[PDB]
Amino acid sequence: GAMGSMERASLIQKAKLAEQAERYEDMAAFMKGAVEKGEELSCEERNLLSVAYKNVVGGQRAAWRVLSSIEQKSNEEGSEEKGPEVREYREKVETELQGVCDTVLGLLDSHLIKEAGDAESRVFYLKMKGDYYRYLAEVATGDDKKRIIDSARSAYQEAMDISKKEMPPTNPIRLGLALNFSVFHYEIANSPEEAISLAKTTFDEAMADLHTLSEDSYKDSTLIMQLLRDNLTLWT
Amino acid sequence: GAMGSMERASLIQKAKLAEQAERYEDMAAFMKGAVEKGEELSCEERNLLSVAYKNVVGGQRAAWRVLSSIEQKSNEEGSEEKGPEVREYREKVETELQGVCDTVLGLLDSHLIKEAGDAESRVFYLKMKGDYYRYLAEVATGDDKKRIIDSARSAYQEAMDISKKEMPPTNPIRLGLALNFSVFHYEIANSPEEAISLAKTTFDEAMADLHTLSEDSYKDSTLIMQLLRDNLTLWT
Amino acid sequence: FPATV
Amino acid sequence: FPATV
Ligand SMILES: CC(C)(Oc1ccc(C(F)(F)F)cc1)C(=O)Nc1cccc(-c2csc(C(=N)N)c2)c1
Numbered sequence: 243g244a245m246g247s248m249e250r251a252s253l254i255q256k257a258k259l260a261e262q263a264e265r266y267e268d269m270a271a272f273m274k275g276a277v278e279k280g281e282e283l284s285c286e287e288r289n290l291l292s293v294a295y296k297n298v299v300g301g302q303r304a305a306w307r308v309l310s311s312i313e314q315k316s317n318e319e320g321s322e323e324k325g326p327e328v329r330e331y332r333e334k335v336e337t338e339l340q341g342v343c344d345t346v347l348g349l350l351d352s353h354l355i356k357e358a359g360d361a362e363s364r365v366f367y368l369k370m371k372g373d374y375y376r377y378l379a380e381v382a383t384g385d386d387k388k389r390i391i392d393s394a395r396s397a398y399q400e401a402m403d404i405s406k407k408e409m410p411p412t413n414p415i416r417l418g419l420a421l422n423f424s425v426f427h428y429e430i431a432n433s434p435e436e437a438i439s440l441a442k443t444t445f446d447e448a449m450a451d452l453h454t455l456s457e458d459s460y461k462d463s464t465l466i467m468q469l470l471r472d473n474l475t476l477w478t
Numbered sequence: 479g480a481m482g483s484m485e486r487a488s489l490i491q492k493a494k495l496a497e498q499a500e501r502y503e504d505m506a507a508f509m510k511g512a513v514e515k516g517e518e519l520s521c522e523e524r525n526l527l528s529v530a531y532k533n534v535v536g537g538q539r540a541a542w543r544v545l546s547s548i549e550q551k552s553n554e555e556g557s558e559e560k561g562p563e564v565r566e567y568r569e570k571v572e573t574e575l576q577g578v579c580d581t582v583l584g585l586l587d588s589h590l591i592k593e594a595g596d597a598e599s600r601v602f603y604l605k606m607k608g609d610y611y612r613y614l615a616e617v618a619t620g621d622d623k624k625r626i627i628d629s630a631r632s633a634y635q636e637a638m639d640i641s642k643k644e645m646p647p648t649n650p651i652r653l654g655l656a657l658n659f660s661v662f663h664y665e666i667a668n669s670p671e672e673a674i675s676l677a678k679t680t681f682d683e684a685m686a687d688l689h690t691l692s693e694d695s696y697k698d699s700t701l702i703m704q705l706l707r708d709n710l711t712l713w714t
Numbered sequence: 715f716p717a718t719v
Numbered sequence: 720f721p722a723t724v
């Protein structure tokens with residue numbers, strides 16, 4: 243690791259600077275270095291890690307979608323052959339995306355998840371595991387596509403089971419997990435009815451628990467609840 | 479060069495794909511590979527090259543400014559020492575920026591400028607040379623800061639001299655050169671009066687030549703003329 | 715796209 | 720910032 247010689251605290255500080263500078267590849271490298279120091283991550287640090295890689299892979303996903311769309315048009319009946327270049331470059335971006343996903347999954351497996359005992363850390367990491375298998379599933383086409391999908395499902399399901407036992411229904415981690423698992427059902431698993439059921443039940447159970455919350459916790463929970471509603475509006 | 483095995487035409491095609499995907503680092507690498515094939519660049523290809531590196535260095539400049547601002551606040555009377563990290567990371571971004579500038583300047587010197595005989599190509603490349611020395615000047619602080627500034631000035635001046643002899647006053651390359659040389663005067667050379675004079679004279683001479691233009695050429699010229707006006711409004 | 719966080 | 724192209 244090229245960050246092995248830098249202090250953990252300096253890596254975290256520089257991750258925060260990189261975020262302010264919108265340098266998310268640097269942010270991700272700094273937070274990978276911090277994870278590789280071997281200590282557990284605090285709540286703030288977990289969110290720095292997730293923000294960094296979400297921005298990196300989010301850009302890769304957007305590029306992949308543009309290129310895949312161009313590639314499909316080039317393969318429609320009537321298109322003028324423009325050679326291997328579109329496929330090659332889509333493949334290049336796809337391989338870089340898979341590499342980022344594999345890196346994140348590797349950090350979770352070595353050894354963030356196995357040391358995560360509290361619900362807020364363990365659910366957070368298992369949600370990430372589901373998310374990054376989901377991104378692999380978005381581009382998968384081979385002998386292991388079903389196994390990638392099932393790896394996403396299994397991670398989301400373990401996270402869900404813990405969240406329902408250990409977190410209130412308004413906990414924003416629980417809400418964001420359900421939001422993303424619902425999108426997994428809709429977009430990956432071809433299970434729109436499960437997606438809709440999960441989003442609606444999550445929203446309604448959260449609504450009923452809002453009365454227990456402070457103003458600041460209310461704002462956090464209702465933010466994610468609005469995303470659940472937005473998706474339900476898109477889907478119904 | 480890692481692009482040495484790819485066809486020139488494939489590099490150009492992939493640069494255009496990278497642009498559509500907003501993958502400007504890839505775009506720049508593809509266009510560097512195309513330049514290194516040793517052939518002159520067409521008008522479209524020159525603009526692909528400039529668009530790619532402008533986006534790459536533009537992001538680096540924005541990050542550098544954020545970090546420099548944080549660094550200056552940390553060095554105000556009353557700040558809590560937060561160690562070497564802000565300076566280190568600003569330096570890291572600065573070195574990467576200087577590397578990109580050196581790469582572009584290297585392509586212009588080996589051998590785009592010396593083979594550029596037509597005004598539209600030669601003025602274009604000399605403007606780029608001024609621009610990338612200007613970006614080096616923005617971060618320079620050492621024994622060579624004045625020499626960097628004079629390298630920018632010299633390149634802009636040669637471009638200006640050719641443009642006034644060989645291009646009409648509405649030519650968008652001539653206009654964009656004057657726009658940027660004017661910003662050089664204002665922001666780098668501490669010569670705001672020269673900046674204002676150059677922008678105003680360029681604008682007025684272009685205005686008087688608009689009557690010669692087609693509708694499409696008119697739109698191109700008036701676009702840059704509006705940028706000259708915008709800067710004059712900022713400065714007066 | 716649908717929303718994810 | 721001032722405009723450049
Ligand atoms: C998006 C939003 C509003 O809500 C979320 C995010 C993630 C999840 C899920 F993925 F866990 F499900 C659910 C809701 C959020 O970011 N909340 C949040 C909560 C706690 C800490 C931080 C934070 C600390 S540091 C830092 C930084 N960007 N520097 C950001 C941010």
Ligand SMILES: CC(C)(Oc1ccc(C(F)(F)F)cc1)C(=O)Nc1cccc(-c2csc(C(=N)N)c2)c1
Pocket residue numbers: 497521522523525526529602605650651652653654655701702724
């Ligand atoms: C910004 C704008 C509107 O005007 C300019 C640009 C540069 C200059 C100066 F730097 F030369 F001074 C002056 C005005 C512009 O981009 N004009 C333009 C003109 C000619 C060709 C292209 C083009 C071909 S391909 C391609 C692509 N992005 N794929 C873009 C674009």
